[PDB]
C-alpha cells in the first residue's frame, strides 16, 4: 500500500504527572507530539506493517464497534526476546509480557499466537479500556521509560461526518494503566478483528522531546497547550508565561550558526629521519 | 523431587509475618536476610519450588552439599537468598495401600546443574551396551519409590519442603512487602510521609475537586499544597507550620524595663494579649 | 553397633533360624536387609536381599520375615554341612556406616563370581608402613564409572564394616574410621577405578574388598558379584 | 550472648513483661525458648517456638518475637508464678546459648531420671548415665543441660534421634564423648580433662525433634526434664 | 604473659582514662562468683607469640 | 574474538568491502590473515601480513590494516570469487583466533594429505597422522585447523619447525599431545578425554615460518592446505 500522510493538529498533549494545578501555566519538557506534523494515514479498509518505536507513539482508532483491537508491541517479535500482546477481549483486557513469537500472522479466538514459554505478567483487567452518524475516536499515547510502559488513553465521541481526518479541538489523555514491566520495545505491530466467518483507519505518530506550555483550568484539567519551538509566536508565548502576548517586541532565545567543516592545518613536513639509511646497508653490526 | 513446581509469584505485598502462623512449620531457616528486614525489601519475582523428602534428607537441602537428593534432584548454589521452609506432612500423605507414587531418581550419570528440573523417564544405560529399552543385567529403572507408611517413626516420614528463591535482575521490583500505616491527626502541625512525599504541616480539610487520577498537588511556584490520602478518598490540605518573627518593643533602658513581645503571623491561639493585623 | 549371636551349632538344620537383633525400630526406611555368607578363602556371596524373592541360588533358604524387630532368616532344612559366617545389614539411616554384624558362627557341623564380570586387586605384599598404595578392581564387564561401588575391609576375627562409599560421579564420602585420612580418587572413566592409602595409621592391615554394588542401599543390579581380597601386611 | 533483667518486680493481680534481647545471629535466625524452673525442683518447658505452648502449660503465659528480642507476658500472675525464667536460643555457630534468669519474686508420664555423679579424683572423671521408660528413644533427641548450685543453666552437648551428627559446647569440645547404644533407653557421656570447674547437676533433658537442632530451626524444643544427680568434684 | 590484653566490656571506655580491671566479667545477669562458668572469664587474655 | 559479517551480499561488476574488527590485543599487535575456501574443496591462503599476496593469488584481491581492523577489497569480482572468507589473528595470550566466515555469494607442488580419522568409542580416541612428500619438514611449522561440517574453522594446536615448544588452544590444552619424529615427513597428534564435541576434519595445515608464531609476528602465515579425513565420533 502507498501510505498517505495527514497534518496532525493540536492533539496528544497528555498529563506528564499526577499533580493538581488550578489556573496556572506549566512549562513541561518531555516526550510530546509536535504540533502540525505528518502522521501516516494507514487505512484498514488489509494492512499490518511494522513501525519503528523510537520513544513513544500516538495510536488512533475511529473504529465503529470492534474493528481495531489489540497491540503487538515488542522488540524483535521473536521467540528469543520477550514481547507485549495487550489485547481487548469481551469486557476484559489481557496484558502479558510472555515471549510468544507468532503462529502464522497477527490476525484475530486467540489465533494471534500458538506457543508456550515462560511469562512475566498476566494482568487480566476486568474493566475494559474501550446514533447513526456518530463515530467514536480513541487516542492512545504509548511511552516507555527505564522501568515503566505508560499507556494514556482518551475516548471522544466525534460527531462531524466529514472525510476521515483528525478533527479540530484540544483533548488531553488520562492515565489508566502503569505497567511496571521492564522490557525494551522497538517495534510496533497492529492488527484488526478480521471475523470473516472506508471502515476505519488508524493514525500512528512519533513523539519527540520538546517543551510545551499547558494551561490548567480551575477544575484541574488541561484546556490547551502551546508549543515552544513551532514558530516565533510559539517561542514568544513559551519564554513568557502568558498566552495573551501584548503588542510589542520581545527578546527570545539567541541564535548562532554552527560550523560545518573542520580544517586542521599543520606545517609542511621536512627533515626526515635517517632511518632510511639505517635499514639499508651491507655490514650492520655485531 | 523429579518434577517440582516453579511458581513465579510477583505483583503482591508478600507479608512474611503471616507465614509464621499459616501451618505448624518445623523449619524456617532463611539464608539470605532476616525475616524482620525481609518485609522492607522489594523484589522482582519469587520462585516457589516445593517437593517432598524424608526427615533424614532435610539436612541435604543447603546452599552447596552432596547427597542422594542434593546432587540428583535439586541443588542450590552458594547464593540462595530465600528460605528452606519445611514441615512434616504425615497426616494425609501416608495411607496403608502401597506408596508407589513418588520417586527420587536413585540412578544418574553425573551431578545436575543447580536449579534444574529433569523430567525424564528413559532407562538408565550403564555404558558398554546400546539399550534400546530392556531391563536386565545392564540397564535398570533409574527411578525408585519411597516406603512411607503411617506406622513408622519420624525421620522417614513425608516432609514437604518449599523454597522461595529471590532474584533481582535488570527489571523493576514488583513484590515489596507490607507497609505500615498509622492514623491521621487533623488541625495540628505534624510531619507526614505520604507515599515518599515527606514534609511537615497542618493537615486540614479542603474543598478541592481533584481528578480521579491525580494524587499529589503543587502550587503556582513549586510548592506542595494538597495531596490525596492513600486511604479512603479524602481531599486534604497541607499548610506549612506556624512560624513568624519575634519583635520586642522597649521604651528604652532609662525609665523602666517593661517590654512588649510581638509575634508576627499568628492568631494569638498558636504561640494582656491583643490581636492586630 | 548391632546384636548378633556369637555362635549357632545346636540342632543343625532344624531350629537354627539365626537372626540379628539390636534394632529397636522399624529398620529405618527401606526394609531391605541383606544376608552375606562370608566363607574362608574366596570372597563372600549374597544369599538374600529382601524379606522374600530370593535371587538365583540355593532354594532351601528363604522366608526372611521381619519378626518383632529382627529379620529371622529361616535356614532350617538347608543342609547339615557348612562352614561360613552369616552377616546381616540394617540401620539404613542417612550416612551411617558399620551396617554389618559381628561374627556369627553358624557351622551346623564344623568338621565337614569368577568369570561373571571380573575380579582383580593390587596384591600389596609386604606394604611399607605409610606411603601411598593404590588398589584397583578393573572390570571388563559392568561399567567401572557409572555403577555404585563400595569398599569394605575385614580383619581376622573382627567383622566387616563400611570403609568407603562413592556415588555415580559427584560424591566422595568417607567412613568414620579414617575421618579424613583416606582420599578416594577415581581413575580414567573408561579403564578402571582405583583407591589410595594416603599414609595409613597401622589400622589398615585388614583385607579389602571392592564390591560392585552398595551394601545397605543394595539394588538388584542383575547379579551380586564379589572379588577376592588381598593382605596388606603392614610393617609398622 | 543474651541480655535478660536480673530480678524484676511486680504486684499480684496485674501483669509483668519479661524481655530477652539477642543479636540477629541467634534470635534473628531462630526461635527463642522460654523455660520455667521452680526453686528446688527440676525445670520444665514453658514456651517453645514463641507461638505454641505444651499441654501442661496453661493459657496464663504468652510470648512474642517482635524484632530481634523476645517478650514474655503473664496475664494475672499469682504466688505460684514465682519461679526462675530462662531464655534459650540456638545460634548459627553450632551452639546453644542460654539466658541469665529472671527472679520474678512477689511477696503478695515418662521419667527421665539420670545418675552417674559422685566426687571423683580431679583431672580424670567417670561416665554420665541416663535412662527413661518407654518414650521412643529412637524418635527423640537428648540434651545435656547442667546447672551449678545457685548459678544458672547452660547447654553441654546434644545427641539426635538418628544417632549421626552431634554437637558440643564451646568449652567442652574435644574432651567430651557422647554416645548411645542399641539397648534400652540410655545415654552415655564420657568426660576428660577435668579442670575441677564442673560442679553442676548435668540434667539429661528430653527433646521432641529427631535430627540435630541446626536444620530444624522451628521444631526444636525440650520436653519434661528429669531428676539429675549432684556431682561435686571439688578437686 | 608479660603482654596482657583485656576483653569486651558491657560499657564503652572513656578517652584518657585507664582501664585497670581485675574482677570477673558477668555475662548477662548470672554472676559466676569468681569460678569461671559459661561465657564468664577474666579480662586478662594473654597475647600469644611465636 | 573477531567480529566479521556472517553472510554479506554483492553484485557483479562492482567491488565490495569485507571487514574484520578486533581488539588491539590481537589485531593491534599482530597482522591479520585472510583465507579463502571454496565450497567443497580444501581452503587456501589468500592474503598474508596484509601487504603481500602468494604467487597463486592474482592482483584481484587487496587488504588493508587501517587502525585496529582489517579491510578486504576485491576490485572486479566474478562468479569464481564466490567462496568463504575467514579472518585469522594471533593474540598475545598465546592463541590463534579465527573468524566466522563471509558468505559472499552472488547469483549473477607438494601434497599435504593426512588421515587417521574414523568413528571410535567415546571417551577415548586414536592418533591423528599427517604426511607429505619432500617439502623440508624441518624448516616449516605445522598447524591443526579443524573444520566442522557446515560450521567455521578454528585453530587447535601448533608445532614449530624446530620441534621444541608447541602451543595448544584454550579447550584442547592438556588432553592433547602433538609431536614429530626424525623420520620422513610426519606429525603425530594424540587426543585424550573425548567429549564427543570433535566432529571436524582436522586439517594438517602447512606453514612457512620456523619458530612458533609468537616471536615472528610479521612472517607467520599458512601454506597450501591438504585433503583431510572426515572423523565423526557421534558418541
Ligand atoms: C524466560 O525464558 C528466557 C529464555 O531465554 C529466559 O532468558 C528468561 O530469563 C526467562 N524469564 C522470563 C523473562 O520470562
Ligand atoms: C469546575 O468547578 C466548579 C466549582 O463550582 C464546578 O461548578 C464546575 O462544574 C467544574 N467544572 C466546570 C465545568 O467548570
Ligand atoms: C481501605 O479500606 C477501607 C475499609 O473501610 C476503605 O474504606 C478505604 O476506602 C480503603 N482505601 C483504599 C484506597 O483502598
Q: What are F50's strand-pairing partners?
A: none
Q: Give B197→chain A minimum CA distance, Å.
A: 12
DSSP, res C88:
E
Chain E residues within 8 A of D100 when measuring between CB atoms? 27-30
**Which residues does B265 contact at the CB level (< 8 Å), separation at least 6?**
B242, B243, B244, B245
Dihedral sign (CA B124, B128, B130, B136): negative
Q: Do chains E and A touch (3 or more CB pairs under 8 A)?
A: no
**Which residues does D71 contact at the CB level (< 8 Å), separation at least 6?**
D17, D18, D19, D20, D63, D64, D65
CB atoms within 10 A of CB B196: 6
Q: Do chains C and E touch (3 or more CB pairs under 8 A)?
A: no
Q: Do chains E and F touch (3 or more CB pairs under 8 A)?
A: no
Q: Which three cell numbers stand for residue B194?
A: 505520604
Position A15 in a domain: yes
Q: Which domain holds residue D96?
A: 2-103
| CB proximity B210 to A under 8 Å | yes
Ligand number nearest CA of B181 is: 3
- Is C93–B155 a contact, with Cβ atoms under 8 angstroms apart? yes
| CB proximity C196 to B under 8 Å | no
Reported as half-sphere exposure (CB side, CA atoms, 13 A), residue D130 has a value of 27
| CB proximity E30 to D under 8 Å | yes
A274 SS3 class: helix
Resolution to one decimal, Å: 3.9
DSSP, res F132:
-
Ligand 2, residue A219: give the atom nearest the CA: 1
Chains that touch E (3 or more CB pairs under 8 A): D
Q: What is the DSSP string of chain D?
A: -EE--S-----TTS-EEEEEEE-TTTTTTS--EEEEE-TTS--EEEEBTTTB--SSS-TT-EEE--TTEEEEEETT--GGG-SEEEEEEEETTTEEEE----B----------EE------SB---EEEEB-SSS-GGGS-EEEEEE-TTS-EEEEEEE-SSS--EEE-SSSSSSEEEE--SSSSB-EEEE-SB-S---B--EEEE-S-SS-TTT-TTT-----------B----
Size of interface C-D (CB pairs under 8 A): 20
Determine the Cα angle at F136 with ends F132 and F139, to 5°.
Answer: 125
C108 near C13, Cβ under 8 Å? yes
Sheet hosting strand D176-179, strand order edge to edge? D114-115, D127-130, D188-191, D176-179
Distance (Å, rounded) from C-alpha A73 to C-alpha A97? 10
Q: Give A270→chain B minimum CA distance, Å.
A: 57
B9 near D201, Cβ under 8 Å? no
Reported as half-sphere exposure (CB side, CA atoms, 13 A), residue D174 has a value of 4
- Which one, of F187, F108, F113, F200, lies nearest residue F154 by Cα? F200
Q: Which domain holds residue A14?
A: 5-256
Given phi > 0 = left and psi -120 to 50 = alpha, else beta, which region is D10? left
Would you give the end-to-end CA distance of chain B in angstroms?
Answer: 80
Distance (Å, rounded) from C-alpha F209 to C-alpha D90? 71
Backbone angles phi, psi at C21, to 5 degrees: -85, -170
- Is A21–B217 a contact, with Cβ atoms under 8 angstroms apart? yes
- Is D163–C23 a contact, with Cβ atoms under 8 angstroms apart? no
Measured CA to CA in angstroms, residue A177 lies from A57, A95, A125, A151, C65 at distances of 16, 10, 10, 6, 70
Distance (Å, rounded) from C-alpha A16 to C-alpha A30? 8
- Which one, of C72, C82, C104, lies nearest residue C12 by Cα? C82
C207 near C231, Cβ under 8 Å? yes
Measured CA to CA in angstroms, residue F9 lies from B50, F17, F102, F107 at distances of 53, 10, 9, 10
Residue of the CA atom closest to atom 10 of ligand 1:
A118
Q: Which three cell numbers stand for residue D147?
A: 546447672
Q: What are C71's strand-pairing partners?
A: C66
Determine the Cα angle at F104 with ends F103 and F107, to 5°.
Answer: 110
Number of domains within chain A = 1
Position A41 in a domain: yes
| Burial of F154 (C-beta count, 10 Å sphere; 0-12/13-18/19+) | buried
Q: What are A196's strand-pairing partners?
A: none
Ligand number nearest CA of B233 is: 3
Position A226 in a domain: yes
Ligand number nearest CA of B229 is: 3
Distance A245 CA to ligand 2 centre (A): 27
Q: Give A173→chain B minimum CA distance, Å.
A: 11
Distance (Å, rounded) from C-alpha A97 to C-alpha B241? 47
Buried b / exposed e across C197-235, counting CB within 10 Å, b at 16+?
Answer: bbebeeebbbbbbbbbbbbbbbbbbbbbbbbebbbbebe
Ligand number nearest CA of B215 is: 3
Q: After which residues is chain F broken (C to N over 2.5 A)?
A: 108
Q: Which three cell numbers stand for residue D71?
A: 517478650
**Which residues does C157 contact at the CB level (< 8 Å), separation at least 6?**
C103
Q: Do chains F and A touch (3 or more CB pairs under 8 A)?
A: no
Could you tell me what percentage of chain A is helix, strand and coil, using 3-state DSSP and rounding each to the nearest 5?
A: 5, 30, 65
> What determination technique applies here?
cryo-EM
- Is D67–B30 a contact, with Cβ atoms under 8 angstroms apart? no
Chains that touch F (3 or more CB pairs under 8 A): C
Q: Which three cell numbers stand for residue A5?
A: 500522510
Q: Which three cell numbers stand for residue D143?
A: 540434651
Distance (Å, rounded) from C-alpha A210 to C-alpha B275? 52
Chain D residues within 8 A of C96 when measuring between CB atoms? 162-164
Distance B228 CA to ligand 3 centre (A): 13
Name residue, grid cell 606545517.
Answer: A267
- Is B24–D162 a contact, with Cβ atoms under 8 angstroms apart? no
- Is D182–C24 a contact, with Cβ atoms under 8 angstroms apart? yes
Measured CA to CA in angstroms, residue B138 lies from B130, B204, C53, C56, D230 at distances of 10, 84, 20, 17, 63
| CB proximity D135 to B under 8 Å | no
Chain C residues within 8 A of D164 when measuring between CB atoms? 93-96
The finding on whether A282 has its CB within 6 A of some atom of ligand 2 is no
Chain A residues within 8 A of B210 when measuring between CB atoms? 20, 220
Q: Give D116→chain B minimum CA distance, Å.
A: 30
A185 near A74, Cβ under 8 Å? yes
- Is D100–E30 a contact, with Cβ atoms under 8 angstroms apart? yes
Measured CA to CA in angstroms, residue B98 lies from B102, B146, B153, B159, C31 at distances of 11, 10, 17, 18, 14
Q: Which three cell numbers stand for residue F111?
A: 601434497
Residue of the CA atom closest to atom 11 of ligand 1:
A118
E42 near E34, Cβ under 8 Å? no
Q: Which of residues 124-153 of C touch B (CB under 8 A)?
A: 141-143, 145-147
- Using CB atoms, which residue from B10, B170, B214 is nearest to A18? B214
**Which residues does C79 contact at the CB level (< 8 Å), separation at least 6?**
C13, C60, C108
CB atoms within 10 A of CB A255: 5
Chain B residues within 8 A of A221 when measuring between CB atoms? 211
Name residue, grid cell 604467487.
Answer: F55
Chain D residues within 8 A of C23 when measuring between CB atoms? 182
E19 near E13, Cβ under 8 Å? yes
Q: Give A243→chain B minimum CA distance, Å.
A: 16
B76 near B114, Cβ under 8 Å? yes
F124 SS3 class: coil
Distance (Å, rounded) from C-alpha C42 to C-alpha F143? 55
Task: Supply the CATH number for residue F16's domain.
Answer: 2.60.40.10
- Is C168–B109 a contact, with Cβ atoms under 8 angstroms apart? yes
**Which residues does A220 contact at the CB level (< 8 Å), separation at least 6?**
A20, A21, A22, B208, B209, B210, B211, B214
Separation of CA A188 from chain center: 10
Amino acid at each position: 500500500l502507498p501510505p498517505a500522510y495527514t497534518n496532525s493538529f493540536t492533539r496528544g498533549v497528555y498529563y506528564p504527572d499526577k499533580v493538581f494545578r488550578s489556573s496556572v501555566l506549566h512549562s513541561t519538557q518531555d516526550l510530546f507530539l509536535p504540533f502540525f506534523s505528518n502522521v501516516t494515514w494507514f487505512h484498514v479498509i488489509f494492512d499490518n506493517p511494522v513501525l519503528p518505536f523510537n520513544d513513544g507513539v500516538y495510536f488512533a482508532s475511529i473504529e465503529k464497534s470492534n474493528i481495531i483491537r489489540g497491540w503487538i508491541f515488542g522488540t524483535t517479535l521473536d521467540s528469543k526476546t520477550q514481547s507485549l500482546l495487550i489485547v481487548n477481549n469481551a469486557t476484559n483486557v489481557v496484558i502479558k509480557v510472555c515471549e510468544f513469537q507468532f503462529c502464522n500472522d497477527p490476525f484475530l479466538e486467540f489465533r494471534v499466537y500458538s506457543s508456550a514459554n515462560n511469562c512475566t505478567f498476566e494482568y487480566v483487567s476486568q474493566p475494559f479500556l474501550m446514533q447513526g452518524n456518530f463515530k467514536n475516536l480513541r487516542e492512545f499515547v504509548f511511552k516507555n521509560i527505564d522501568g515503566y510502559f505508560k499507556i494514556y488513553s482518551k475516548h471522544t465521541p466525534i460527531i462531524v461526518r466529514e472525510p476521515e481526518d483528525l478533527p479540530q479541538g484540544f483533548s488531553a489523555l488520562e492515565p489508566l494503566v502503569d505497567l511496571p514491566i521492564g522490557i525494551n520495545i522497538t517495534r510496533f505491530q497492529t492488527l484488526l478483528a478480521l471475523h470473516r466467518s472506508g471502515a476505519a483507519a488508524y493514525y500512528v505518530g512519533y513523539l519527540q522531546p520538546r517543551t510545551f506550555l499547558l494551561k490548567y483550568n480551575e477544575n484541574g484539567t488541561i484546556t490547551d497547550a502551546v508549543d515552544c519551538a513551532l514558530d516565533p509566536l510559539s517561542e514568544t508565548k513559551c519564554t513568557l508565561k502568558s498566552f495573551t502576548v501584548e503588542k510589542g517586541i520581545y527578546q527570545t532565545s539567541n541564535f548562532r550558526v554552527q560550523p560545518t567543516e573542520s580544517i586542521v592545518r599543520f606545517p609542511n613536513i621536512t627533515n626526515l629521519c635517517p632511518f632510511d639509511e639505517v635499514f639499508n646497508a651491507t655490514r650492520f653490526a655485531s | 523431587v523429579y518434577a517440582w513446581n516453579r511458581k513465579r509469584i510477583s505483583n503482591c505485598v508478600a507479608d512474611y509475618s503471616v507465614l509464621y502462623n499459616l501451618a505448624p512449620f518445623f523449619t524456617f531457616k532463611c539464608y539470605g536476610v532476616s525475616p524482620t528486614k525481609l518485609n522492607d525489601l522489594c523484589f522482582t519475582n519469587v520462585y516457589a519450588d516445593s517437593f517432598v523428602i524424608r526427615g533424614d534428607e532435610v539436612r541435604q537441602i543447603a546452599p552447596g552439599q552432596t547427597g542422594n537428593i542434593a546432587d540428583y534432584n535439586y541443588k542450590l548454589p552458594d547464593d540462595f537468598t530465600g528460605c528452606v521452609i519445611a514441615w512434616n506432612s504425615n497426616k494425609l500423605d501416608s495411607k496403608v495401600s502401597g506408596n508407589y507414587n513418588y520417586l527420587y531418581r536413585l540412578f544418574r550419570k553425573s551431578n545436575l546443574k543447580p536449579f534444574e528440573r529433569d523430567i525424564s523417564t528413559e532407562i538408565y544405560q550403564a555404558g558398554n551396551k546400546p539399550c534400546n529399552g530392556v531391563a536386565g543385567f545392564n540397564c535398570y529403572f533409574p527411578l525408585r519409590s519411597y516406603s512411607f507408611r503411617p506406622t513408622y517413626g519420624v525421620g522417614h516420614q513425608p516432609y514437604r519442603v518449599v523454597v522461595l528463591s529471590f532474584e533481582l535482575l535488570h527489571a523493576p521490583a514488583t513484590v515489596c512487602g507490607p507497609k505500615k500505616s498509622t492514623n491521621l491527626v487533623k488541625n495540628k502541625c505534624v510531619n507526614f510521609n505520604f507515599n515518599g512525599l515527606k514534609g511537615t504541616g497542618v493537615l486540614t480539610e479542603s474543598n478541592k475537586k481533584f481528578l480521579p487520577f491525580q494524587q499529589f498537588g503543587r502550587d503556582i511556584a513549586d510548592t506542595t499544597d494538597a495531596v490525596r490520602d492513600p486511604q479512603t478518598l479524602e481531599i486534604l490540605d497541607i499548610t506549612p507550620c506556624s512560624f513568624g518573627g519575634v519583635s520586642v518593643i522597649t521604651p528604652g533602658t532609662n525609665t523602666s524595663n517593661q517590654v512588649a513581645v510581638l509575634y508576627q503571623g499568628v492568631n494569638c491561639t498558636e504561640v494582656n494579649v491583643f490581636q492586630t493585623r | 553397633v548391632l546384636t548378633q549371636p556369637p555362635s549357632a551349632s545346636g540342632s543343625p538344620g532344624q531350629s537354627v533360624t539365626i537372626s540379628c537383633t539390636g534394632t529397636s525400630s522399624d529398620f529405618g526406611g527401606y526394609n531391605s536387609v541383606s544376608w552375606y555368607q562370608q566363607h574362608p578363602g574366596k570372597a563372600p556371596k549374597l544369599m538374600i536381599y529382601e524379606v522374600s524373592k530370593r535371587p538365583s541360588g540355593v532354594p532351601d533358604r528363604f522366608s526372611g520375615s521381619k519378626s518383632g524387630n529382627t529379620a529371622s532368616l529361616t535356614v532350617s532344612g538347608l543342609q547339615a554341612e557348612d562352614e561360613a559366617d552369616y552377616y546381616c545389614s540394617s540401620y539404613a539411616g542417612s550416612n551411617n556406616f558399620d551396617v554389618f554384624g559381628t561374627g556369627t558362627k553358624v557351622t551346623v557341623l564344623g568338621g565337614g563370581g569368577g568369570s561373571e564380570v571380573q575380579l582383580v586387586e593390587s596384591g600389596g605384599g609386604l606394604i611399607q608402613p605409610g606411603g601411598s598404595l593404590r588398589l584397583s578392581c578393573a572390570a571388563s564387564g559392568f561399567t567401572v564409572s557409572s555403577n555404585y561401588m563400595s569398599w569394605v575391609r575385614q580383619a581376622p576375627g573382627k567383622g566387616l564394616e563400611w570403609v568407603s562409599v562413592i556415588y555415580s560421579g559427584g560424591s566422595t564420602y568417607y567412613a568414620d574410621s579414617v575421618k579424613g585420612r583416606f582420599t578416594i580418587s577415581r581413575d580414567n572413566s573408561e579403564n578402571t577405578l582405583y583407591l589410595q592409602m594416603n599414609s595409613l595409621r597401622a589400622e589398615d592391615t585388614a583385607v579389602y574388598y571392592c564390591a560392585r554394588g552398595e551394601i545397605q542401599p543394595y539394588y538388584y543390579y542383575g547379579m551380586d558379584v564379589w572379588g577376592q581380597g588381598t593382605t596388606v601386611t603392614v610393617s609398622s | 550472648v543474651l541480655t535478660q533483667p536480673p530480678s524484676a518486680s511486680g504486684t499480684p493481680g496485674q501483669r509483668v513483661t519479661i524481655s530477652c534481647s539477642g543479636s540477629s545471629s541467634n534470635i534473628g535466625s531462630n526461635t527463642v525458648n522460654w523455660y520455667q524452673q521452680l526453686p528446688g525442683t527440676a525445670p520444665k518447658l514453658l514456651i517453645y517456638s514463641n507461638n505454641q505452648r505444651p499441654s501442661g502449660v496453661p493459657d496464663r503465659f504468652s510470648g512474642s518475637k517482635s524484632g530481634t528480642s523476645a517478650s514474655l507476658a503473664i496475664s494475672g500472675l499469682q504466688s505460684e508464678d514465682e519461679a526462675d525464667y530462662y531464655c534459650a536460643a540456638w545460634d548459627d555457630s553450632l551452639n546453644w546459648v542460654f539466658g541469665g534468669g529472671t527472679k520474678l519474686t512477689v511477696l503478695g508420664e515418662v521419667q527421665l531420671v539420670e545418675s552417674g555423679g559422685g566426687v571423683v579424683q580431679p583431672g580424670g572423671s567417670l561416665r554420665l548415665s541416663c535412662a527413661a521408660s518407654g518414650f521412643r528413644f529412637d524418635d527423640h533427641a537428648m540434651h545435656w543441660v547442667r546447672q551449678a548450685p545457685g548459678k544458672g543453666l547452660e547447654w553441654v552437648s546434644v545427641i539426635s534421634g538418628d544417632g549421626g551428627s552431634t554437637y558440643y559446647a564451646d568449652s567442652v569440645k574435644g574432651r567430651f564423648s557422647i554416645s548411645r547404644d542399641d539397648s534400652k533407653n540410655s545415654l552415655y557421656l564420657q568426660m576428660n580433662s577435668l579442670r575441677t570447674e564442673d560442679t553442676a547437676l548435668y540434667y539429661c533433658a528430653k527433646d521432641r525433634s529427631y535430627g540435630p537442632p541446626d536444620v530444624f530451626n522451628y521444631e526444636y524444643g525440650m520436653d519434661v526434664w528429669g531428676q539429675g544427680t549432684t556431682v561435686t568434684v571439688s578437686s
